[PDB]
Design a protein around this ligand. Structure first.
Ligand SMILES: CCCCc1ccc[n+](CC(P(=O)(O)O)P(=O)(O)O)c1
Ligand SMILES: CCCCc1ccc[n+](CC(P(=O)(O)O)P(=O)(O)O)c1
Ligand SMILES: CC(C)CCOP(=O)(O)OP(=O)(O)O
Ligand SMILES: CC(C)CCOP(=O)(O)OP(=O)(O)O
Ligand SMILES: [Ca+2]
Ligand SMILES: [Ca+2]
Ligand SMILES: [Ca+2]
Ligand SMILES: [Ca+2]
Ligand SMILES: [Ca+2]
Ligand SMILES: [Ca+2]
Lengths: 362, 362
């Protein structure tokens, strides 16, 4: 991909800056500097970089569209790379903390950060907070003289909050919400009355769509000075449609994609997660199959988990996902066509992001 | 306290705004809104409000020293209260995450948030992140048209990073730093070679002094538009001296103050923390007492803990603290006198903060 070599060079630059700033400001010693370097490398690298490279693709598209000269283009691509690394380090923070919350075993084909024997959940919580803090440090340093710094911080921090509210919906989805009460232990549901299409949409739009689709598009517009050239409502809507679909794919792959190909071991079934598969099953399956689901879901027993995967297979959940995907293609294409009539350059950058999403396999 | 009634009124306003913003933006339901209200009240209320009320005391002192009409003074006090609550919600976030990391039992005379049976560590991590995100949301909303928004976000996020680096030093302080390696489990020290005055100072300056002393003084100056009317270097030095002392008091109280008075059960002795007591003991005690300390420290056995507290008592650590405290008050009074020669209004507000710190009992 066109910007990978530039994006990787900016990673080395931003790492040297952040570790050097810690030596200057916090009397950082050689041993902890080395620990933080390995933490940054382990938590920030190894993913697909769809969020970071989107910022650069958008910023280049809009820089060409507005005919920026060689010096201005070089600045926009460098700024775009730094904003990309803000989102990648936000992702790194989110996955560190989520791997602790889900008690997960593998991430990007390596042990979860907290499961490194030299780490533990106790230290990893704080390592994940350093990652989050470092994302803002990059804006405050690299964009100190840029009029777009204010808007970069606003959209970044808004999406940061959004994602934690989605995570609140996610971690409370398997308990009766009327019984959500800090003073009283919460039994996992046995009736699954709240496993609804509305509740699934609300989890995935807030926990995933905002930081995965909306934030990279907006940051690429902000760094190129072109946010006012596009339809904000139309941009938001296509980000929500693609983001929901992206997390639906992630939900389908939890069950049906081998962990060795995905690079992680999902436990949506053993954790009774309100996944797209769980909701689509519960709302479409015959009564006797719903009963077998309730008797087996949310159990660590490998046979129980196999019963659930057999129920999903027998209810044609992969076929049902394919019909959902067809409806999403129709809607994304219509929204892109509407963007394209207003600003073709930005519409092309949404098509790039959509082509890396549609029918992905990991 | 002059500003308590105004400060508690602004709490109720900020709470209504944040919960209402979540209903508006994130389709927040009545049950989770109730959960978040209970979480905010439990994690943000019940402390001494030293950080938040400092912001208002500094802002009022500096606004009175300027000539401005009643409407302008009302705006400075309201902004100061919001900035105070930013720091209180940052404190709330720090204590929620630290209580998970320390596996602690009590905070402000109630169970730790994560230990509420309807919460657990795996939900509380995310509740702690909501608190941190809400702090920035307050600035972005209330200070949307204020000239100091950018500099408020910069100092806030700088101190946010600083505290996590202090926390890194704190959580790694009991492992030989040459053996710090994410890949390899590492036994806690048996020789305590790194339990040095320098290493204690580095922990407490970054983990406590920046957010407890520096941040409230600087926010008070920013919201009143008077940061450039004071000596930034001298302000930093007095904040580092007072904040080191504040954390030394906290370390002494971990051992010597009844948990029912303190409102928390410290485990510095069980957890082998590099506390002021441990460093002062190891650098002053006779050789056989150092050996007995090493045989008993870092043990959950109540007999082992009782041996350490007896060794501390025998080495007169409370008297050694009184001598340190005499040296600190000599230094603070000199630094305040020097500030008073430059800006008497600001120096008075440093006296108010010091007066709440010096010889405190909790
Ligand atoms: C801590 C904030 C939550 C971040 C967040 C948002 C979206 C997806 N994830 C991770 C995924 P996964 O762990 O990559 O499968 P999920 O657990 O299925 O939701 C985490
Ligand atoms: C999560 C960042 C840590 C924040 C932080 C900094 C200063 C004091 N604390 C908590 C105190 P305490 O728990 O109030 O006694 P410590 O555990 O002694 O350090 C936490
Ligand atoms: C939003 C969610 C499914 C979390 C994982 O996101 P991802 O598949 O983009 O992960 P990588 O950053 O590893 O590419
Ligand atoms: C920095 C530290 C000792 C943590 C506790 O701070 P504190 O004693 O000011 O706590 P409150 O917010 O409960 O007053
Ligand atoms: Ca999760
Ligand atoms: Ca997960
Ligand atoms: Ca998943
Ligand atoms: Ca601690
Ligand atoms: Ca603690
Ligand atoms: Ca303490």
């Amino acid at each position: 991909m066109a910007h990978m070599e530039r994006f990787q060079k900016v990673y080395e630059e931003v790492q040297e800056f952040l570790l050097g700033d810690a030596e200057k400001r916090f009397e950082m010693d050689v041993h902890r500097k080395g620990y933080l370097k390995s933490m940054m490398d382990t938590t920030c690298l190894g993913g697909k970089y769809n969020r970071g490279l989107c910022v650069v693709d958008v910023a280049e598209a809009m820089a060409k569209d507005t005919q920026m000269d060689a010096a201005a283009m070089e600045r926009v691509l460098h700024d775009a790379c730094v904003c990309g690394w803000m989102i990648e380090m936000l992702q790194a923070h989110f996955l560190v903390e989520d791997d602790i919350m889900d008690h997960s075993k593998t991430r990007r084909g390596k042990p979860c950060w907290y499961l490194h024997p030299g780490v533990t959940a106790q230290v990893a919580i704080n390592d994940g907070l350093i990652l989050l803090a470092w994302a803002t440090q990059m804006a405050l340093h690299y964009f100190a003289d840029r009029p777009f710094l204010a808007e970069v911080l606003r959209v970044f921090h808004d999406v940061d909050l959004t994602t934690y509210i989605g995570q609140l919906y996610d971690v409370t989805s398997m308990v009766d919400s009327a019984k959500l009460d800090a003073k009283v232990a919460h039994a996992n549901t046995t009736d699954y009355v709240e496993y609804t299409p509305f509740n699934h949409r609300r989890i995935v739009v807030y926990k995933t769509a905002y930081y995965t689709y909306w934030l990279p598009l907006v940051m690429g517009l902000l760094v190129s000075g072109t946010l006012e050239k596009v339809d904000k409502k139309a941009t938001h809507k296509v980000a929500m449609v693609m983001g929901e679909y992206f997390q639906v794919q992630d939900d389908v792959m939890d069950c049906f994609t081998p962990p060795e190909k995905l690079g992680k071991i999902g436990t949506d079934i053993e954790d009774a997660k309100c996944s797209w598969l769980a909701v689509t099953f519960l709302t479409t399956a015959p009564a006797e199959k719903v009963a077998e689901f309730k008797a087996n879901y949310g159990s660590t027993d490998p046979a129980a988990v196999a019963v659930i995967k057999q129920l999903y297979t027998e209810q044609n959940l992969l076929a049902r996902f394919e019909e959902y995907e067809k409806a999403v293609v129709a809607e994304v294409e219509q929204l892109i066509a509407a963007l394209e009539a207003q600003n073709a350059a930005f519409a092309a950058s949404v098509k790039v992001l959509w082509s890396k999403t549609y029918k992905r396999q990991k």
